Amino acid sequence: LRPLVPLDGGRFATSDLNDLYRRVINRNNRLKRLLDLAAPDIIVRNEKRMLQEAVDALLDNGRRGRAITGSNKRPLKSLADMIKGKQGRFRQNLLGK
Amino acid sequence: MVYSYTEKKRIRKDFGKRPQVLDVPYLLSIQLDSFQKFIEQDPEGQYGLEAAFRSVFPIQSYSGNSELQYVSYRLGEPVFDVQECQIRGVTYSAPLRVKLRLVIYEREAPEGTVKDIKEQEVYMGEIPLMTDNGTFVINGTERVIVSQLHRSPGVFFDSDKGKTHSSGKVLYNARIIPYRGSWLDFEFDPKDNLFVRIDRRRKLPATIILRALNYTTEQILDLFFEKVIFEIRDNKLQMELVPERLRGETASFDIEANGKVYVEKGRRITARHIRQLEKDDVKLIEVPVEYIAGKVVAKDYIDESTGELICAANMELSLDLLAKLSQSGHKRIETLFTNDLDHGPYISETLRVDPTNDRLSALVEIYRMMRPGEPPTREAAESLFENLFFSEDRYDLSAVGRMKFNRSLLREEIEGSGILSKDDIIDVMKKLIDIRNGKGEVDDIDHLGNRRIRSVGEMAENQFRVGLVRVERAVKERLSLGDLDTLMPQDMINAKPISAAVKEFFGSSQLSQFMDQNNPLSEITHKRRISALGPGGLTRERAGFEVRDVHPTHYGRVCPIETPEGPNIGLINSLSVYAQTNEYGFLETPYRKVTDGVVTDEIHYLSAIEEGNYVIAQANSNLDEEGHFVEDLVTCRSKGESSLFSRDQVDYMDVSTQQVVSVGASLIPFLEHDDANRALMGANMQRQAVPTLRADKPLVGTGMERAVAVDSGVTAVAKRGGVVQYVDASRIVIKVNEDEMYPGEAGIDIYNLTKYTRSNQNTCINQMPCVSLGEPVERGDVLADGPSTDLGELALGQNMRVAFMPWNGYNFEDSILVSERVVQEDRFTTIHIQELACVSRDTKLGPEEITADIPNVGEAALSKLDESGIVYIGAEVTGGDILVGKVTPKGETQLTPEEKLLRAIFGEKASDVKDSSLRVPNGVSGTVIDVQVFTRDGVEKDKRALEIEEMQLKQAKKDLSEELQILEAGLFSRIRAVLVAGGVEAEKLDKLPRDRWLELGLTDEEKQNQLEQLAEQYDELKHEFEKKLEAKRRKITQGDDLAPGVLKIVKVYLAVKRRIQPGDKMAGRHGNKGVISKINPIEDMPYDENGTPVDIVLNPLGVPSRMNIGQILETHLGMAAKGIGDKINAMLKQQQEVAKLREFIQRAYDLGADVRQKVDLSTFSDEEVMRLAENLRKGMPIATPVFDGAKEAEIKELLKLGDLPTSGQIRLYDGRTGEQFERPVTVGYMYMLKLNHLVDDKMHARSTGSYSLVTQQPLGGKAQFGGQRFGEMEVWALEAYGAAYTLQEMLTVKSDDVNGRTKMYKNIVDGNHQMEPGMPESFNVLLKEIRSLGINIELE
Structure with missing residues (x-):
């Protein structure tokens, strides 16, 4: 049900999905273990700001500081590539199969 | 002269009275010339590797006291051969040599040098070379770079009137474009102020950047403007007169010039009053005070009494200010003209609006405009201003930069500085102020005088130069790291920037691509192409208007006919x-x-x-x-x-008249008759024609293809021709004549013919000998023919019988009707060679052995495969049969120790579960050509490739042993010649070696000198020949460089015979290309008075409908040609004497009015052309030039001479009913075309097949699955027909629903006929994705 159509035949590369995966993985796991562990202001502040940018940055704004600029695949802008392949969901459904 | 040795077999009859004094050039000289100038050594420093090495070199670190001087470079020989390298499939490149010398300077000691540094060459990168045909060999591909077209560097005068700006007025602009670096442009606004735009940044006024050029306002007005003259002595207010500098006046009072009034108060300003004071000589005059307040001051004059800044330049004068200035004791006053007729008040609004009056604040402001993030620190502003504007590295005006810069600048000398100049940009601002003033002419964007083509030389020079700079950075770091470095150019220079720049450049680029090869035509016209794509020259991806148009500069160079009729039009051209x-x-x-x-x-x-x-x-x-x-x-x-x-x-x-056409459309005869649109379509269809079995030279033609076939490099030509010795399909050798030879090495010229080989178009290529044996060969004669070539004359299609007719509605629109006779004649049959490669290996579970078993499969495939090796060569592979067996380790060991040492795994030994076998895909069946597999170092116990590894050794040993026998045999015959009179014996020497025992003794000198010499060069040629033989065998058995991600590579060639087909497709030279409706029996074809059923049936309505004129003259003139060949063929049926037929042949040559230099019988009359009669017995090779082609008078005169009815119409009878058709019918013989559009390749039927993990929709075509596609247009077509079923179950049952397919196939049993509507799983991919979205929707 998840399946994503890769542009290169199925590669994930440097995309902000992978950037938010590297930041949201450690920041989200350390945020869960920190919140459940009653972490102090240092770990709850760093994990709350890093995880806050993990959930919030994937939602809106953020800086596309992914790998090196240029010569890299960057299929994340509004995170609308999931709902709309090109002009919409037509390729998946409501258009010709 | 008119020797015509190589053309004596077929002399193509030429028409037209227009001679050609300048012969057709080699025509590849753009790529060949660009290459030979790309690799060259010159003292002048021409553009290339020497220009890059001299550009970057000397390489010196900052404050390091070390420099690097260039010894330039020299190129070596590649490790492989051209054809052999293409067979091996590895990139073809020569190493680079002659590394640069270093230098060392003593620190704190001037001129002190410890020692001079001269170092041996170091390996840097790999420089690919070019084949004589103009291709590039990388990984066994054709790799040709398309020619590029873009703007040439220089000062541009552009109109640039926006149609979307709604202003309705022209806004002039000019932009200097260097070959590299940032761009500098000027921009007008309705405020009439000169603006500056640099690299898309916002446009700053001219006063801030020109102020950053360190020019004060006094130099601005005094430089760009003329201060005129104003003089005041005791307020006399005398000024010079400029009667020719302005047309106009406003006079509120009388003005007297030298005691006489030039213009009275209120007097007319007309030229009658002008020329009176103009033509006469007048000096400075005195006029009242009120004229100062209206004029604008030019220079900067300050009061001499006190030090205030009042009365600054470029400011308005006030009535009360005149009293402060004139009374201050100023010596002279400069006032601006400032009257708009032929001029304008430029630079004024730039001075007023420009915030920065100084060069320092100007540099800070332009720095802040360049970098938005960091506030300028004022420290680097000088380096940013110099490097941004005038610098050696960032300018790169090159050649055309200063050439066009001086041409538009109206300079004299061509050579100039390669950097920006202040007086040059001031001249651009002045002449641009003239453009805004209204005088001068603008320049056209589409005018090719402003365009320059770029090729492999300049492009590879650019990328290679960029890589060389990338090396200069790291080398600069290495030299800057240490204080003193001995033997620096050793480990400091790395080859990865060079090899990455050139290997990534020629490896992957928009211009560089492999070609689809159909006939030499598509290869040569695909070799010469103009492209506005790639870097530069591309305005937008689609649409565009004035860019795609055709300028008058497109007349004599680029061909407007040849063109990419597809999505992008007018971009690609042909020279x-x-x-x-x-x-x-x-x-x-x-x-x-x-x-x-x-x-x-x-x-x-x-x-x-x-x-x-x-x-x-x-x-x-x-x-x-x-x-x-x-x-x-x-x-x-x-x-x-x-x-x-x-x-x-x-x-x-x-x-x-052929200067306006290209090689692609130039081979279409009767261009002036046929319409330009259908000629464009046909010229677009010429490149897709697949070569067939038998190549028959076109009986209607041009005569350019004679030079195109030999200049295309496809056919096998001969160097230093001579008497041919041995011939064969694999090899051809020629004994060279003694007229022109090299004194050393002796030997003869050998040729290796290429067998059937796969192309990039999956076609078949090969060369066949045109000569028998013992025939003298000149220099430049073609020995063998390539694909779709006959006797060095290009034929990419086949002629056949032609009749114009409707027949029982089977011909409708462009539909074509083919007889079964041509079906039985093997014509149009072609070979399609597809390559199958099974390459995996590379497993951490252990290596994968090739063949030796096929797991879980019976002996059916084991009968085709060898025990220790692959299948027999030239076998029948049908369906999913395994062409090359390959195994995999898979589970390897396990409990029940690998099934008791593969006991339960039977005889595979891997254990079980090897999917690595090739398993030929379904739907593809044919015969295999050759298995090239792979060649690696240190590999043993491989039964595959053994036969070809031995065959190469026997081949090189055979053809090298031939030259060895020529040498040793020649010198041995020289021994037999020199032993004469020194003790010779014919009976003894004609039955024994040694030569009586090495020429005996004779007279002492001949003994030691002749005998010791004979042994010296005898053992020298024997031992040297064996040493070179071993050196070559080592290259045969050493192999190539395999991809590291595999142990062993396997690749096989397969071929299929595909002939004329019912669906198929066919094309004409004039642009008619259609499918064949049905292939009809011979008995159903109408016949003539002689009973000769017609091969083809076309639609005559397409001549008026599609405006195709040339088909009539084509078919009729062809009927005349085959009338000549038919009459001569009848003479051969009668076995007539040569002379009786020779008269008709000569008359056939010289009939008409001139229009050729050819004369029959000229050479001996009893051979050559005499046998060429038996060569042309099938048809006559008639040619017509492009615009000079034949006229209906000579066409009907020749066709009337061929005994055929002059009208070109023959009474015809029905082949079916036997009754006669009313009225005469036009018939003839035209040249046809077989394409790649055959419906075995186009048509693939599929029902159920592999799907994808994404949405559960199958991939698409070419996968032997899927229903093709019915898009949204078909969705609205079912909504249009009003069928809810077909659409609803369409989008759901087939893909998004498994229930529809399972229940459907289950209902096929007993035929329940119901299809489940289902819940779409693709709609569950939409619900899915939405669930991943922060708003997740769930059903109730």
């Missing part, structure tokens, strides 16, 4: 046959010089700029023996038009 590239990249075309009233025989190449002013006559014109023109008023052209001009107004001539 003219006689076109050439200038030194700056400009394109020049030939014109014949004309002096006084006679036409001299010299021809000069002219570009657009030079030929624009000159007047040149029309291509076709009347010529006389005295050189003068017959008609007084001759059609000529000057600029952008053409009209009748006098005989004294014609500067040059167009020579041939």
Whole structure:
């Protein structure tokens, strides 16, 4: 049900999905273990700001500081590539199969 | 001369009275010339590797006291061969040599040097080379770079009037474009102020950047403007007169010039009152005070009494300010003209609006405008201003930069500084102020005088130079790291930037690509192409208007006919046959010089700029023996038009009429008759024709293809021709004549013919001998023919019988009707060679052994595969049969220790579960050509490739042993010659070696000298030949470099015979290309008075409908040609004597009025052309030039001479009913075309097949699955027909629903016929994705 159509035949590369995966993985796991562990202001502040940018940055704004600029695949802008392949969901459904 | 040795087999009959003085050039000289100038050694420092090494070198670190001087470079020989390298499939590149020398300077000690550093060459990168045909060999691919076209560097004058801006007025602009670096442009606004835009940044006023050039306002007005003159002595207010500098006046009072009034108060300002004071000589005059307040001050004058800044330059004067200035004791006053007639108040609004009045604040402001993030620190502003504006590295004006810069600058010397100049940009601002003033002419964007083509030389020079700079950075770090470095150019220079730049450049680029090969035609016309794509020259991805148009500069160089009829039109072009590239990249075309009233025989190449002013006559014109023109008023052209001009107004001539066409469309005869649109379509269809079995030279033709076939490099030609010794399909050798030979090495020239080989188009290529044996060969003669070539003459299609007719509705629109006779004649049959490669290996579970078993499969495939090796060569592979067995380790060991040492795994030994086998895909069946597999170092116990590894050794040993026998045999015969009179014996020497025992003793000198010499060069040629034989065998058995991600590579060639097909497709030379409806029996074809059923049936309505004229003259003239060949063939049926037929052959050559230099029987009359009668017995090779082609008078005269009815219509009877058709019917013989559109390749039927994990929709076509696609247009087509079923179950049951397929196939049993509507899983991919979205929707 998840399946994503890769542009290169199925590669994930440097995309902000992978950037938010590297930041949201450690920041989200350390945020869960920190919140459940009653972490102090240092770990709850760093994990709350890093995880806050993990959930919030994937939602809106953020800086596309992914790998090196240029010569890299960057299929994340509004995170609308999931709902709309090109002009919409037509390729998946409501258009010709 | 008219020797015509190689053309004596077939002499193609030529038409037209227009001679060609300048022969067709080699025509590849753009790629060959660009390559040979790309690798060269010159002291002048021409553009190339020497220009890059001299550009970057010397390489010196900052404050390191170390420099690097260039020894330039020299190129070596590649490790592999051309054809052999293409067979191996590895990139073809020569290493680079001659590394640069270093230098060391003593620290704190001037001129002190410890020692000079001269180092041996170091390996850097790999430089690919080019084949003689113009291709590039990388990984066994064709790799040709398309020619590029873009703007040439120089000062541009552009109109740039926006149609979307709604202003309705033109906004002028000018931009200097260097070959590299940032761009500098100027921009107007309605405020009438000069603006500056640099690299898309916001436009700053001219006063801030020109202030950053360190020019004060006094130098601005005094430089760009004239201060005129104003003088005040005791307020006398005397000024000079400028009566010719302005037209106008406003006079409120009388003005007297030297005691006489020039213009009275209120008097007329007309030229009657102007020229009175103008033509006469007048000096400075005195006028009242009120005229100062209206004028604008020019220079900066300050009061001499006190030090205030009042009365600054570029400011308005006030009535009360005149009293403060004039009374201050100023010596002189400068006032601006500032009257708009031919001029304008430029730079004023720039000075007023410009915030920065100084160069420092100007540099800070332009720095802040360049970098938005960091506030300028004022420290680097000088380096940013210099490096941004005038610098050596960031300018790169190159050649055309200063050439066009001085041309538009109206300078004298061509050579100039390669960096920006302050007086140069000030001249651009002044002449641009003239453009805003209204005087001067703008320049056209589409005018090719402003365009320059770029090729492999300049492009590879650019990328290689970039990589060389990337090396200069790291080398600069290495030299800057240490204080003193001995033997620095060793480990400091890395090859990865070079090899990455050139290997990534030629490896992957928009211009560099492999070609689809159909006939030599598509190879040569695909070799020469103009592309506006790639870097630069591309305005937008789609649409566009004025960019795709055709300018008058497109006449004599680029062909407007040939063009990419697909999505992008007007971009790709094709150069003219006689076109050439200038030194700056400009394109020049030939014109014949004309002096006084006679036409001299010299021809000069002219570009657009030079030929624009000159007047040149029309291509076709009347010529006389005295050189003068017959008609007084001759059609000529000057600029952008053409009209009748006098005989004294014609500067040059167009020579041939073919200068406007290209090689692609130039082979289409009767171009002036056929419409240009359908000729464009046909020229677009010429490149897709697949070569067939038997190549029959076109009986209607041009005569350019004779040079195209030999100049395409496809056919096998001969160097230093001679008497042929041995012939074969694999190899051809020739004994070279003694006329021209090299004194050393002796030997003869050997040739290795290429067998059937796969191309990039999956076609079949091969070369066949045109000579028998013992035939003398000249220099340049073609020995063998490539694919779709006959006797060195290009034939990419087959002729066949032609009749114009509706037949029982089977021919509708463009539909085609083919007889079963041609079906039985093997014609149109072609070979399609597909390559199958099974390459995996590379497993951490252990290596994968090739073949030796097929797991879980019976002996059916084991009968085809060898025990220790792969299948027999040339076998029958049908369906999913395994062509090459391959195994995999898979589970390897496990409990029950690998099933008791593969006991339960039977005889595989891997254990079980090897999917690595090739398993030929379904639907593809044919015969295999050859298995090239792979060649690795240190590999053993491989039964595969053994036969070819031995075959290469026997081949090289055979052809090398031939030359060895020529050498040792020649010197041995020399021994037999020298032993004469020194103790010779014919009976003894003719039955024994040694030569009586090494020439015996004789006279002492011959003993030691002749015998010791014979042994010396005898053992030298024997031991040297064996040493070279071992050196070659080592190259045969060493192999190539395999991809590291595999242990062993396997690749196999397979071929399929595909012939004329019912669906198929066919094409004409004039652009008619259609599918065949049905292939009809011979008995159903109408026959003539002689009972000869017709092969093809076309639709005559397409001649008026699609405006195709050339089909009538094509078929009729062809009927005349085959009438000649039919009558001569009848003479051979009667076995007539040579002379009786020789008379009709000669009459066939010289019939008509001139239009050729050919004369029959000229050479011995009893051979050559005499046998060429038996060569042309099938058909007559008639040619017509492009625009000079035959006329209906000579066509009906020849066809009437061929005993055929002059009208070209023969009474025809029905083949079916036998009854006669009413009225005569047009028949003839035309040249047809077989394409790649055959419906075995196009058509694939599929039902159920593999799907994808994404949405559960199958991938698409070419996968032997899927239903093709019915898109949204078909969705709205089912909504249009009103069928809810077909659409609803369409989108759901087939893909998004598994329930629909399972229940559907289950209902096929007993035929329940119901299909489940289902819940779409693709709609569950939409619900899915939405669930991943922060708003997740769930059903209730």
